Amino acid sequence: QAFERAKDLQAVIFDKTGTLTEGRFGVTDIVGFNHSEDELLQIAASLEARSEHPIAAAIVEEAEKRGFGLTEVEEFRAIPGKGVEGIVNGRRYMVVSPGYIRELGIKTDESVEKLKQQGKTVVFILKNGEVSGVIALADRIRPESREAISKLKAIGIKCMMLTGDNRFVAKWVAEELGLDDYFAEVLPHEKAEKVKEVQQKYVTAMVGDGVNDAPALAQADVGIAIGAGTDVAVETADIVLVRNDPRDVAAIVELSRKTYS
């Protein structure tokens, strides 16, 4: 009777990662300090071409997205605890972590703090030992998510999120989406209890992975397993969405409000 009782929902809680966000790192910002952004990306991706680190891979992917060819790096070195280094265009470049910038005693532009305050992962590009720019990355918000939330708010549903991610990341996603509430630092075995807390006020849906988030979906009044695919049957969720489109939650509620069976 899950489709039928969707009409009576008052609150929807999304698990963040993979549902409202892509579930992988992506470049959000490129900031040059008297240095072009396209050049910054091209150089950084050139230097990170051989890395297996997910952040390096995301930088390389953004250069692919923008159609930037890579440059052969001379005197390449990978330095654990710092980053990577190479000669490009007769200048010594590095792509390094903020930890290393601090260990080198290098000052950073005050503007970079805004990126850190969004919980973004920041990579520094150095040119001859001076900061040339930064690239910021996040588990990016899905294109569909802003509309998924706006549709739900339009029908009076409180839109919430839980995540194991830190409060900076959680706040950033919540603010981008205009969420009514969010819960950060929620470990897997604590998700069901957060659903229960919301149910103190609201008939509540939980939206998440039917396999990983089974207990929270079970606690919800309507457990919506999303991105379930067509291989592993999710026997335990109330409603299972094959694809991974958060706008389908509003579609279920809106159609339920038009119908009975």
From Swiss-Prot:
List of catalytic residues: 15
Topological domain spans for side Cytoplasmic: 1-261
Domain of life where this protein originates: Archaea
Positions of phosphate binding: 16-17, 163-164, 191
Coiled coil: none
Family the UniProt entry places it in: Belongs to the cation transport ATPase (P-type) (TC 3.A.3) family. Type IB subfamily.
Stated role: Involved in copper export.
Protein name stated in the entry: Copper-exporting P-type ATPase B
Organism of this sequence: Archaeoglobus fulgidus (strain ATCC 49558 / DSM 4304 / JCM 9628 / NBRC 100126 / VC-16)
Lineage, uppermost ranks: Archaea, Methanobacteriati, Methanobacteriota, Archaeoglobi, Archaeoglobales
